[PDB]
């Protein structure tokens, strides 16, 4: 039941449109997905209906400011239901031209799977 901090965080990388380019394996024991199945799919696929619009807004703030902390939101779990999550997002830039390369996300889970 109780899990240690390391086991409650998973790192993800996204292209600037929010499509997964990488996800660490810690996601599997927290909400069921294997990273391979997430690659190339939009973050939005996994946002709960009630948070999707708020995520759009956080994404806008992330791209202007370069970093954001999300609100509490729900990520849809692989077999139904959702976990509550918070994410710290960071845009990675090319310093030579200030162009955005990708988004780094540090995702940490705030609940067990709920229905």
């Amino acid at each position: 039941e109780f899990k240690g901090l390391d086991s409650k965080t998973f790192l993800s990388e996204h292209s600037m449109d929010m499509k997964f380019t990488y996800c660490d394996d810690r996601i599997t024991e927290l909400i069921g997905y294997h990273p391979e199945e997430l690659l190339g799919r939009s973050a939005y696929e996994f946002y709960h209906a009630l948070d999707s619009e708020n995520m759009t807004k956080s994404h806008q703030n992330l791209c202007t400011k370069g970093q954001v902390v999300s609100g509490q939101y729900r990520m849809l779990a692989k077999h139904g239901g959702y976990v509550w999550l918070e994410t710290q997002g960071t845009v990675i830039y090319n310093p030579r031209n200030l162009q955005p390369q990708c988004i780094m996300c540090v995702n940490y889970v705030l609940s067990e799977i709920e229905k």
Partner: protein, 113 residues
């Protein structure tokens, strides 16, 4: 539109610079398996002329308290060639905790002179 994807991998480090997690994209980027980097200090793979700059980056990233630092240095690939690497890094601590912060890096092979 398809675009040429930069070659990059993510790693995590303690503040001293020891690799404590390495994404498997490291094989395509620098030619090492993750377990060849885990437990070693990233400065061991850094060109001698760039080692002070890289050690200085670790201290600077800690001082930034979560903000991103970008450093460009030469990394010795598995095939013993110096590759230009832009590392963008920042510290993180789960906000519900006071555990020692670690450093998250995104490491991209880029062009440079």
């Amino acid at each position: 539109l398809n675009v040429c994807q930069p070659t990059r991998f993510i790693s995590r480090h303690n503040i001293e610079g020891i690799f404590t997690f390495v994404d498997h994209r490291c094989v395509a980027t620098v030619g090492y398996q993750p377990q060849e980097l885990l437990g070693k200090n990233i400065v061991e793979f850094c060109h001698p002329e760039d080692q002070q700059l890289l050690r200085d980056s670790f201290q600077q990233v800690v001082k930034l308290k979560g903000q991103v630092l970008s450093v460009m240095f030469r990394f010795r690939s598995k095939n013993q060639e110096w590759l230009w690497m832009r590392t963008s890094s920042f510290t993180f601590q789960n906000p519900y905790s006071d555990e020692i912060e670690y450093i998250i890096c995104t490491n991209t092979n880029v062009k440079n002179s």
